[PDB]
């Protein structure tokens, strides 16, 4: 009861004092530090999925070794997901992601010196597992700084770090390695698999490189009784705002802010507090407050990872099945499908940045859905290569929508101390759903045209119908 009286004093408090600091040129640098991991978390995402599955066939490996790969690297972004979500909440933002980044660029660099298979199979597991905390953990270190009359316009334009990660990866596999024999021969001669794991995990080290000049989030600080810290880098974050702006003579004017309050047995002790604290954190998610909603959006997050990666996997086979059935009458084809789905997005993300604040988060998820329903299933009229591709441009810029109002109100939608947490367990959810979905839709390839489009096309309905049972977060005060 006190408890929660002294939360809601330090929000409302909090968007007080981010409204006294304003919007400039902090939120932006940020917004582009955190846009480099976002870029690492979609080059990794392409990696697995596009890169390694064609490399298997290039590295001659038995019929128990063909999906080994990318199912056990997705497993790991599962669990990473999950465990750096659970201690952003204990740690810190900044702290976690630090590790999770310093995690997943050692061992990338790691990966590129191994002489086998098993070696290489582990340190991609390792490379996923730290770069699974990624994005819950960006997502809500730059909603922290963001007042609510516009955290939603600027929480949307972070994906198009995740596409051009995506088409970079792209970009890099096929001029480095384009239909090469991926060996463990290569003598990393540049055009070499060791040379493309090398150059993937520049954006990693880049993405460290700046977060190492950012500060801890202050609402972190806030909530775990840290008054001193928090009150420097609100300081900070007004002072670079008002001499951007070129009013170096306001002086910020916040006074006091309300506050929350053998080596290896201490090591142990210390874990295992930790561990509590995380798997208490986990399971206040499912109590009475949060249970319903947490289920609506484990079902909508299941539904649209689901269905987006069924569609990833299923569209370029049908592609080369056009081409076979024309020529009957690889990298650069992938490489051009993400440069155009990364236009085609651009101008979703402009309508949802300009449409979030001023129709909901609610609205534009249900539209979105439908809308993106309606074009998975237009996705079985195409008859053409061209067609396709128009397609599915139109599908993913119809769709990315209702990603970034769910990533919206999955920040909104929870407690600050809780947040890392829940987005985590969500992400890990997706992260489940992106492997099954590959899965099962890559015994689709010998059926048909239609019928993976219509599981697809249900699924969505499924995520649309459960999107319009969540509530409303426009308006209020981060939690
Ligand atoms: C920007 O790409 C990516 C980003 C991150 C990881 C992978 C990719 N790339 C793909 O997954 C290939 C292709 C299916 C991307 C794509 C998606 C949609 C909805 C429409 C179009 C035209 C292309
Ligand atoms: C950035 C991000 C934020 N929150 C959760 C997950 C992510 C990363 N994404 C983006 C999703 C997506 C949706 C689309 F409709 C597209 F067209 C597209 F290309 C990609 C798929 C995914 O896993």
């Not at 509590?276 to 990872?305: A, D, H, K």
């Given at each position: 009861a006190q408890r929660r009286k002294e939360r809601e004093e330090l929000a409302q408090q909090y968007e007080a004092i981010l409204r006294e600091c304003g919007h400039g040129r902090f939120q932006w640098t940020l917004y582009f530090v955190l846009g480099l991991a976002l870029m690492a978390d979609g080059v990794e995402v392409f990696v697995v999925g596009f890169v390694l599955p064609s490399a298997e066939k290039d590295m001659c490996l038995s019929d128990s070794n063909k999906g080994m790969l990318g199912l056990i690297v997705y497993l790991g972004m599962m669990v990473g997901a999950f465990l750096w979500g659970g201690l952003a909440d204990r740690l810190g933002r900044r702290q976690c992601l630090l590790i999770s980044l310093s995690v997943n660029s050692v061992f990338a660099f790691f990966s590129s010196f191994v002489q086998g298979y098993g070696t290489f199979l582990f340190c991609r597991l390792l490379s996923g597992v730290g770069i699974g905390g990624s994005i819950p953990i960006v997502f809500s270190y730059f909603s922290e700084f963001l007042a609510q009359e516009k955290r939603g316009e600027?929480?949307?334009?972070?994906?198009?770090?995740?596409?051009?990660?995506?088409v970079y990866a792209a970009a890099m596999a096929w001029a480095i390695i384009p239909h090469y024999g991926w060996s463990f021969g290569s003598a990393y001669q540049f055009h070499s698999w060791?040379?493309?794991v090398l150059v993937c995990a520049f954006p990693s080290?880049?993405?460290?490189?700046?977060?190492?000049?950012?500060?801890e989030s202050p609402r972190f600080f806030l909530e775990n009784g840290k008054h001193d810290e928090a009150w420097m880098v609100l300081k900070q974050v007004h002072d670079t705002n008002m001499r951007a702006k070129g009013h170096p003579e306001r002086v910020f004017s916040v006074t006091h802010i309300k506050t929350i309050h053998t080596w290896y047995q201490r090591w142990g002790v210390r874990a295992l507090?930790?561990?509590?604290?995380?798997?208490?954190?986990?399971?206040?998610?499912?109590?009475?407050?949060?249970?319903?909603?947490?289920?609506?959006?484990?079902?909508?997050?299941?539904?649209?990872?689901?269905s987006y990666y069924g569609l990833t996997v299923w569209f370029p086979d049908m592609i080369r099945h056009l081409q076979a059935v024309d020529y009957?009458?690889?990298?650069?084809?992938?490489?051009?499908?993400?440069?155009?789905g990364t236009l085609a997005v651009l101008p979703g993300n402009i309508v949802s940045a300009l449409l979030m604040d001023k129709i909901g988060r609610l609205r534009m998820l249900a539209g979105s859905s439908v809308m993106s329903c309606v074009s998975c299933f237009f996705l079985s009229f195409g008859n053409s290569e061209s067609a396709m591709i128009a397609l599915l441009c139109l599908f993913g810029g119809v769709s990315i929508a209702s990603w970034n109002a769910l990533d919206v109100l999955t920040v909104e939608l929870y407690p600050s101390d809780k947040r890392t947490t829940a987005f985590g367990f969500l992400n890990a959810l997706c992260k489940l759903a992106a492997v099954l979905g590959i899965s099962i839709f890559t015994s689709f390839v010998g059926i048909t045209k239609a019928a993976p489009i219509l599981f697809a096309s249900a699924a969505l309905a499924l995520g649309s119908s459960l999107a319009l049972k969540l509530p409303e977060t426009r308006g209020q005060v981060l939690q």
């Open positions: 600027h929480l949307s334009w972070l994906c198009m770090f995740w596409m051009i990660g995506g060791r040379v493309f080290v880049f993405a460290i490189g700046a977060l190492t000049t950012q500060p507090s930790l561990g509590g604290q995380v798997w208490g954190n986990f399971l206040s998610c499912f109590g009475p407050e949060y249970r319903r909603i947490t289920l609506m959006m484990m079902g909508v997050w299941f539904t649209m990872s689901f009957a009458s690889g990298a650069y084809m992938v490489y051009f499908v993400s440069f155009l």
